[PDB]
Amino acid sequence: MLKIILPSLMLLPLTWLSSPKKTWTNVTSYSFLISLTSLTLLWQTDENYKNFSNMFSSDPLSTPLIILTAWLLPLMLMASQNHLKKDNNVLQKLYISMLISLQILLIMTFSATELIMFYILFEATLIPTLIIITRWGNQTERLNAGIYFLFYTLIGSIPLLIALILIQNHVGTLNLMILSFTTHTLDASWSNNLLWLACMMAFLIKMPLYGVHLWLPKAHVEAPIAGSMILAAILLKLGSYGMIRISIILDPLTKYMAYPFILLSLWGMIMTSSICLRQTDLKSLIAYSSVSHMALVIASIMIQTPWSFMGATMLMIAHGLTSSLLFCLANSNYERIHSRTMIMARGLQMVFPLMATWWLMASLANLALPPSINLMGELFITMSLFSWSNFTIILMGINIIITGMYSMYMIITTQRGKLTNHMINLQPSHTRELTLMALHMIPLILLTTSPKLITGLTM
Amino acid sequence: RLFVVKPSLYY
Amino acid sequence: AFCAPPAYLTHQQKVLRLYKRALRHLESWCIHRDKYRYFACLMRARFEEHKNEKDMMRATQLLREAEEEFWQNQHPQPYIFPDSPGGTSFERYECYKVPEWCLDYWHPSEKAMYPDYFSKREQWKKLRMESWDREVKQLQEETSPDGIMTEALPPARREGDLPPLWWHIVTRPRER
Amino acid sequence: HIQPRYREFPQLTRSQVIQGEFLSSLMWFWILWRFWHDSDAVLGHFSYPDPSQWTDEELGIPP
Amino acid sequence: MNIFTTSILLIFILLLSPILISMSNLIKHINFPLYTTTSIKFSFIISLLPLLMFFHNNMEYMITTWHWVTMNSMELKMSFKTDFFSILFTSVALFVTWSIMQ
Amino acid sequence: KYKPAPLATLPSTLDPAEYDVSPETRRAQVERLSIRARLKREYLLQYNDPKRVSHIEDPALIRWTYARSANIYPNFRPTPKNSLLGAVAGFGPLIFWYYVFKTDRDRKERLIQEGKLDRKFNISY
Amino acid sequence: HMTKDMLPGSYPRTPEERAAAAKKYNMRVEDYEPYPDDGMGYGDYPMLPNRSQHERDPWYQWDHSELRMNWGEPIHWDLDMYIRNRVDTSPTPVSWDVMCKHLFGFVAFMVFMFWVGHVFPSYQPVGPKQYPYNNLYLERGGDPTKEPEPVVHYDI
Amino acid sequence: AHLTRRYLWDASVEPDPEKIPSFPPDLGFPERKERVMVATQQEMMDAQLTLQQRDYCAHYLIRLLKCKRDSFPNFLACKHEQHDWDYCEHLDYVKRMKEFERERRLLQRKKRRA
Amino acid sequence: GKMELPDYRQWKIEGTPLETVQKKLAARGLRDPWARNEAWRYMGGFAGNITFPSVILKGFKWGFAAFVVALGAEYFLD
Amino acid sequence: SDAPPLTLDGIKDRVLYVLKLYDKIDPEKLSVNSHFMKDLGLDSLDQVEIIMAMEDEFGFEIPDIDAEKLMCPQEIVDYIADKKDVYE
Amino acid sequence: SGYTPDEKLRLQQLRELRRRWLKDQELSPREPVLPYRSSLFAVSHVLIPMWFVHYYVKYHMATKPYTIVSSKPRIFPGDTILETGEVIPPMRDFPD
Ligand SMILES: CCCCCCCCCCCCCCCCCC(=O)OC[C@H](COP(=O)(O)OCCN)OC(=O)CCCCCCCCCCCCCCCCC
Ligand SMILES: CCCCCCCCCCCCCCCCCC(=O)OC[C@H](COP(=O)(O)OCCN)OC(=O)CCCCCCCCCCCCCCCCC
């Protein structure tokens, strides 16, 4: 793992003592080489897992998150490049350093073994995100957005820390797989119910539950494109990783202390897919899409079945890639029109006839067009919840319909009408952003061809 | 014979 | 598609448009030309029977009743010419109606062909940055200071001046 | 290739008429061949016996 | 069992070929409509054969071509069930799409 | 006779507002048209204007988005039927679905406990 | 760039406010009518006719053509559902009250008549079909070692 | 037709299509013979027939499939066989109709016995 | 190519249903100023009544002829 | 099967043709500028009929707002030319 | 009321301008500047693919157990099987 972290740490000097003309190039190339080297983790020839130290470890669930994290970096580098172009060399080096720090901390917290290290890193992920969102946003509500994000997270995270201490005291360690080989059943008492609540709310907030989803749309709409991408792809996954790791000891409480969250997820799914029909901001639309998709992940972790966890992992990675792609697609226009309003610009696919394809495929994925991992996840979540109770299929179908509606709405109100001929400032498509979209898509094709790397722990 | 207006497509 | 409605339609215009719609729906109902001519002559007789009348109140009443008769006897699937609203070709070539400014982004190796074309496009601009300032004054100076205003436009009264606000009525794409 | 005509019946090539006539004649030849050799399929080949024309000996019914 | 399966997969290879020339640079130097129509024509001529062999033997086949995944006692793979319905509908639809392309 | 509806509106023909010749009608129409024409002249002094590198803005669209997005809470006031609509929409369906799922799960579990169920070939979940 | 004096605000409780609101939204203080004060965020935003964009004139060369809506015109709070790819309020020769009745009647009568034909079916005067080996007990699943309840099929 | 005779006239003295063999079989038949089967289970199973199809005429159906698989390139050479199968199916239909009429006559007997 | 237009001195109401419509509009006391336009059809290559037999029994002549030919050939070949 | 393009002299021929076929007033004497009310004394109803005949002749509609202003064959030809984009 | 004279002049000017825009949108010659079949198609679009497909089948789809599972061939009385040199006997006397 250290062969992955040390070079990521060295990307910093490179960034600062690189000349003002080659820093972007060099750091991007080496970030790509890091993404390449990270594939050592995929050499899993046995059911035994990796353990490089007492402090690090890798699993079939942490490896894909780690590789997606190491892959998204150069894409964010490329995407944060047109803006902050006039900004000073020092400022853009600061930006690059923020990105690299996020990379390193996310890799660490995915490769961690101890819940408290996981905690300090899952809570150190705030500084760079807050700084990016507040120092490089364009509106005046980015400050309130950072407040919301930061404090939702911390209010959810404190009781988690307290529960971790309670455990570290009852048991003598917070180490994973020891917390597994020594776990006991519980007494189904109110103290342990509150322990459950504490352990869970942090992650149920970091991946937006229906009722506490009021930090994601803000952060997205007010944040730059790299912040949007990382928030949509990985910061929404820290909660899933944490719950998949902490739910092993809370048995057998989640059999009955999970109903409220299953209900909230299955309902907010509909109640956000519907907002995706009547929202005017493209970015907020995609945010509510992310919410409606993470609801499935939540409801699937809650029921604790192998198919459920498999679908959760598949959909996690797939939604990461697809949301990053959609955000970058909307950014391509924003850079040209400086307005997130969707119905303003229309009739594209005439001057941008190719980007209308990327727009289309990112939509084919979000609406779960087979063969695709979005669907290979949704289907198995649906089957697991149908075994749970057969009446979930109703809400699942409603959500499917609304998704197929608002995806094509987003397509047609931007690319499939007639042009706003009064738009003189439609600079043709950059090779850079076409490459962004291609780098987002192709890995989805490859993971659809080899979805054995994406099932997870159970499979 | 006439001229058909079109975008660049070179980029 | 070339003018703007007036602040209010006059009784004459109302009656004329009612006559036109009534005849179009008569065509829709009667598929054969002989029948169409027969009943069109009948309808025009019905109309002319009240052309030399002047009582405005009774006229408006006859019109309010004829419009109801029309709504009650109208064909619900009338004939619409293809390229017109409701027709099977309305807004069909808007996909190929690309504007003119889309050529300012072309690449030298694209306008390298059609060079004789782009030379004209150039001097068509020279004919625009010069003909702009005087198109404003002609509007400023021809303004009604009594508040009243409508969607009309004047021509140019000189040798060399051009109609104000022409670039978009000129330069627009073919229909094809 | 052709010359447009106005308010008149246009000039008619020979191919577009001979081919249609050929197709129609072939369809009718087929109909006739069939209706000749397999008439049953549209008329019938197995009568429908009259109920109650049987005898109580068959379908035995004692008195 | 070599001619049947080969003839079944050859039509797919053929139908795919045009879309491969659709990503290449030959479109601007080919008559794509005529080429695609000829591809459809030969696909129909190929699909005609399985039809004969079935009408003769009345034998149906199952053809598993590629292993996609193995999900804990649940495999998923590319599987073609060549039966009366499939082999006849293929010929009909190809014979029709030929006319339609022209 | 045509009975209008909020989804099949009344046409302009049958609207007695039309055919009205009162000055309080025709003057208002003329003023509306004057406003419309002033706005169209303003917009066309920007469309065809050369030396324009950027696009045209829409203050009306901006107002509309700002109203539908950010001018909501500053004017929100708790009231009866408001608290009630909120509480119902928020909680009612959750309770309904909770009881649905709970009844189903309990029934299934008691069946399985009694062994009165058929789970043939179920080896995945 | 805009300003708090160009953007919307709260419910007008004076004509000193209605005047500025209508002159801002670019309507006249008579046709301008704000939404009722039910504490719902509307504020001073125009309340306009619930007509769609099909009703408007197709022959006019608008500015926003797909929306059929001019440049500075005040926009309907519910445009996203009247954008002409959606809800259509344009009138109809037949009237709601009678069209709904006709459709409901057609459907319900056809359903009732399905049930009538189910109560009184149609068939042909024949006996059930006969399959020799105990209705094909063995082939039809059966069990080889056991024996079936034998059944007979007679002549005539 | 039976439709009217049942749904409007006496509905209790007209048979029911699902209860045709109800009465005893030999109430008017002495030594009522059985319906024979001249096709063997193996002869019918090795031919890959269908369970709606391996009825009392599967032997002629076997001959048909045989004379079809043979002489194949020239279809239309399976008419003399097709006729035989159609005829046996028609005779089976006749037997069914006669069972129906039998049961109706027995209903007449029951209504005339009181 | 240069298009031509035939003389308007030939499109006449005489001998068409336009004439009967004129009889009726005279019985009622009226005139039709447009009938000569619609009268470009109803005369010439467009003249004559087409029948459902006319369209259905097309080809039937040679169809039946070849049918009888093949029938005779079949009787010959036995 | 693509139909041939239009020409100004062709539109002139066709319009004057329809107007010659017209009977109510036109005594077969129609110069390009034979105004309907001044030069021929027609009614707005006759003008409606004339525009509808032009439409049935050429295959498209004339909006009523713009047809209420056509009183000369030359104006008709000019409107149709502006609509069909002729004389490239 | 027809076109006022100002409207008529406006339209005439826009007309003489559009009939020039279109004459200009026309283009000269010499621009745009620029710098057996059945059998060959058969070969290069059927044979080569057919060779690849036969290879794939024969050596990656029939070497595996249950990849090509044919149904069983209809057999009738008198059809003498060849994998065992066997002959099944005919049926019973047909009543008629
Ligand atoms: C806007 C929102 C409101 C924000 C303001 C928040 C106000 C804070 C609430 C006031 C303080 C009340 C909580 C007091 C904690 C009481 C101690 C406790 O509950 O711990 C019990 C349990 C361990 O008990 P056990 O191991 O079984 O044996 C005995 C101990 N050795 O260990 C535990 O269960 C740990 C419990 C930690 C406290 C959990 C708080 C509730 C958790 C769910 C909601 C989390 C969201 C933030 C709080 C919302 C308001 C409660
Ligand atoms: C014996 C049986 C007899 C009874 C059988 C009953 C079967 C169930 C019937 C269910 C189907 C009815 C609901 C279907 C909704 C269709 C909406 C629609 O048509 O959208 C298109 C519509 C424009 O279409 P149109 O009116 O034709 O305009 C043409 C103008 N020339 O306008 C639009 O563009 C709207 C675009 C989408 C708007 C958002 C839709 C949100 C989803 C709501 C619909 C789904 C609700 C669930 C439907 C039931 C299934 C559970």
Count how many domains chain J has. 1
Cis ω before J27 (30° cut-off from 0) = no
Name the minimum distance, in Å, from the CA of E86 to any CA of chain F: 29
Distances (CA, A) of H43 to C79, G135, H82, K89: 68, 17, 19, 9
Contact I63 D22 (CB under 8 A): no
Alpha-carbon span C98 to C92, nearest angstrom: 13
CB nearest I34 (choices: C37, C42, C45): C37
Kindly report the length of chain K: 96
Contact C4 G57 (CB under 8 A): no
Taking residue K70's Cβ as centre, other Cβ atoms within 10 Å add up to 15
Contact I63 D28 (CB under 8 A): yes
Taking residue A144's Cβ as centre, other Cβ atoms within 10 Å add up to 12
A250 lines ligand 1 (CB under 6 A): no
Atom 20 (ligand 1) nearest CA: A191
CA closest to K11 among chain J residues: J78
Alpha-carbon span C162 to K17, nearest angstrom: 9
- Given a contact cutoff of 8 angstroms between Cβ atoms, the answer to whether I53 and C55 are in contact is no
Residue A297 DSSP SS3? helix
Alpha-carbon span G77 to F71, nearest angstrom: 13
Tokens representing A315 are 């959909």
Taking residue C19's Cβ as centre, other Cβ atoms within 10 Å add up to 20
Tokens representing A446 are 């490859």
Residue with tokens 């570290």, as numbered in its chain: A168
Name the minimum distance, in Å, from the CA of H43 to any CA of chain K: 7
A166 lines ligand 1 (CB under 6 A): yes
What are the residues facing A56 on neighbouring strands? Answer: A112
CA closest to F48 among chain A residues: A422
Atom 33 (ligand 1) nearest CA: A195
Helices (H), A38-88: 62-79
- Given a contact cutoff of 8 angstroms between Cβ atoms, the answer to whether K64 and K76 are in contact is no
Query: What's the CA-to-centroid distance between A189 and ligand 1, angstroms?
Result: 14
Atom 17 (ligand 2) nearest CA: G86
A155 lines ligand 1 (CB under 6 A): yes
CB nearest C71 (choices: G59, G61, G93): G93
- E77 backbone dihedrals φ, ψ, rounded to 5°: -155, 165
A159 lines ligand 1 (CB under 6 A): yes
Neighbouring subunits of E (3+ Cβ pairs under 8 A): A, F, H, K
3-class SS shares of chain K: helix, strand, coil, % to 5: 45, 5, 50
Q: Which residues contact G84 (CB under 8 A, 6 or more apart)?
A: G52, G53, G54, G66, G67, G68
The verdict on E61 touching K (C-beta cutoff 8 Å) is yes
Name the minimum distance, in Å, from the CA of G59 to any CA of chain C: 5
Atom 29 (ligand 1) nearest CA: A191
Atom 6 (ligand 1) nearest CA: A155
- Chain I partners within 8 Å of D29 (Cβ): 63-64, 66-67, 70
Alpha-carbon span C151 to F40, nearest angstrom: 7
- Given a contact cutoff of 8 angstroms between Cβ atoms, the answer to whether H81 and H67 are in contact is yes
* 3-state SS, one letter per residue, for C36-85: HHHHHHHHHHHHHCCCCCCCHHHHHHHHHHHHHHHHHHCCCCCCCCCCCC
Sheet (strand E75-82) strand order:
E75-82, E61-70, K68-70
Contact H90 D60 (CB under 8 A): no
Query: What's the CA-to-centroid distance between G57 and ligand 2, angstroms?
Result: 26
Tokens representing A361 are 């495929």
Angle between helix C56-73 and helix C11-29 axes, rounded to 10 deg: 20
3-class SS shares of chain C: helix, strand, coil, % to 5: 45, 0, 55
b/e A165-192 (16+ beta carbons within 10 angstroms → b): eebeeeeeebbbeebeeeeeebeeeeee
Alpha-carbon span F1 to K85, nearest angstrom: 89
Cα-Cα-Cα-Cα dihedral of A248, A254, A257, A263, to 10°? 120
Alpha-carbon span G32 to G47, nearest angstrom: 7
Helices (H), chain F: 23-47, 59-69, 82-114
b/e H25-64 (16+ beta carbons within 10 angstroms → b): eeebbeeeeeeebebeeebbebbebeeeebbbbbbbbbbb
Tokens representing A392 are 């979930």
Contact E56 H69 (CB under 8 A): yes
Q: Which domain holds residue J32?
A: 1-88
Angle between helix E32-57 and helix E3-23 axes, rounded to 10 deg: 170
How far is C-alpha I47 from the chain's CA centre? 4
Whose CA is closest to G132, among K94, K74, H40? H40
Q: Which ligand is nearest to the CA of A190?
A: 1
How far is C-alpha C76 from the chain's CA centre? 25
Query: What's the CA-to-centroid distance between A159 and ligand 1, angstroms?
Result: 6
Q: Residue K70 carries which DSSP code?
A: E
Q: Give counts: helices (H), strands (E), chain J.
A: 4, 0
Residue E62 DSSP SS3? strand
Q: Which of A271, A394, A401 to mutate to test the pocket of ligand 2 (most atoms within 8 A of CB)?
A: A401
Q: Do chains K and E touch (3 or more CB pairs under 8 A)?
A: yes
- Given a contact cutoff of 8 angstroms between Cβ atoms, the answer to whether E43 and K79 are in contact is no
Name the minimum distance, in Å, from the CA of A413 to any CA of chain G: 10
What are the residues facing E62 on neighbouring strands? Answer: E81, K69
Cα-Cα-Cα-Cα dihedral of D47, D48, D51, D55, to 10°? 30
Query: What's the CA-to-centroid distance between A267 and ligand 2, angstroms?
Result: 22
Count how many domains chain A has. 1
Query: What's the CA-to-centroid distance between A110 and ligand 1, angstroms?
Result: 27
Query: What's the CA-to-centroid distance between C81 and ligand 2, angstroms?
Result: 28
Rg (CA), chain J: 13
Query: What's the CA-to-centroid distance between F91 and ligand 1, angstroms?
Result: 24
Q: Which domain holds residue A380?
A: 2-459
Which of residues 15 through 74 in chain E touch F, CB cutoff 8 A?
72-74
Q: Residue A281 carries which DSSP code?
A: B
Alpha-carbon span A76 to A224, nearest angstrom: 10
Tokens representing A227 are 């912040």
Residue of J2, J15, J21, J86 best to disrupt the I interface, most CBs of I under 10 A: J21
Whose CA is closest to C128, among C97, C104, C164, C158? C164
Residue with tokens 């990112």, as numbered in its chain: A362
Whose CA is closest to K70, among E1, G14, A323? E1
Q: Which residues contact H1 (CB under 8 A, 6 or more apart)?
A: none
What are the residues facing B2 on neighbouring strands? Answer: K26
CA closest to C129 among chain F residues: F50
- Given a contact cutoff of 8 angstroms between Cβ atoms, the answer to whether A68 and A110 are in contact is no
Q: Which residues contact A89 (CB under 8 A, 6 or more apart)?
A: A20, A23
Contact G66 A417 (CB under 8 A): yes
Contact F75 G6 (CB under 8 A): no
Task: Please name the helix (run of DSSP H) or strand (run of DSSP E) that holds residue E75, with its range, or none.
Answer: strand E75-82
Which of residues 3 through 22 in chain I touch C, CB cutoff 8 A?
17-18, 20-21
The verdict on C172 touching A (C-beta cutoff 8 Å) is no
Whose CA is closest to J16, among I5, G113, A404? I5
Helices (H), K1-96: 5-25, 37-42, 48-60
CA closest to H6 among chain G residues: G120
- Given a contact cutoff of 8 angstroms between Cβ atoms, the answer to whether C46 and C69 are in contact is no
Cis ω before A371 (30° cut-off from 0) = yes
Q: Which residues contact A412 (CB under 8 A, 6 or more apart)?
A: G85
A401 lines ligand 2 (CB under 6 A): yes
- Chain A partners within 8 Å of F104 (Cβ): 389-391
DSSP letters of A183-219?
-------HHHHHHHHHHHHHHHHHTT-STT-TTHHHH
Alpha-carbon span E21 to E27, nearest angstrom: 7
Tokens representing E18 are 């045009």
Alpha-carbon span C114 to C14, nearest angstrom: 51
In angstroms, this model's resolution equals 3.2
* 3-state SS, one letter per residue, for A339-374: CCECCCCCCCCCCCCCHHHHHHHHHHHHCCCCCCHH
The verdict on G156 touching D (C-beta cutoff 8 Å) is yes
How far is C-alpha K49 from the chain's CA centre? 15
Distances (CA, A) of A435 to A23, A329, A438, G129: 19, 12, 5, 70
Residue J43 appears among annotated catalytic residues: yes
CA closest to I12 among chain J residues: J21
Handedness of CA J60, J63, J64, J66 (dihedral sign): negative
Alpha-carbon span E91 to F83, nearest angstrom: 65
Alpha-carbon span B8 to E28, nearest angstrom: 16
Alpha-carbon span G13 to A37, nearest angstrom: 67
The verdict on H46 touching K (C-beta cutoff 8 Å) is yes
* Structure determination method: cryo-EM
Catalytic residue (one of J43, J78, J82, J85): J43
The verdict on E73 touching A (C-beta cutoff 8 Å) is no
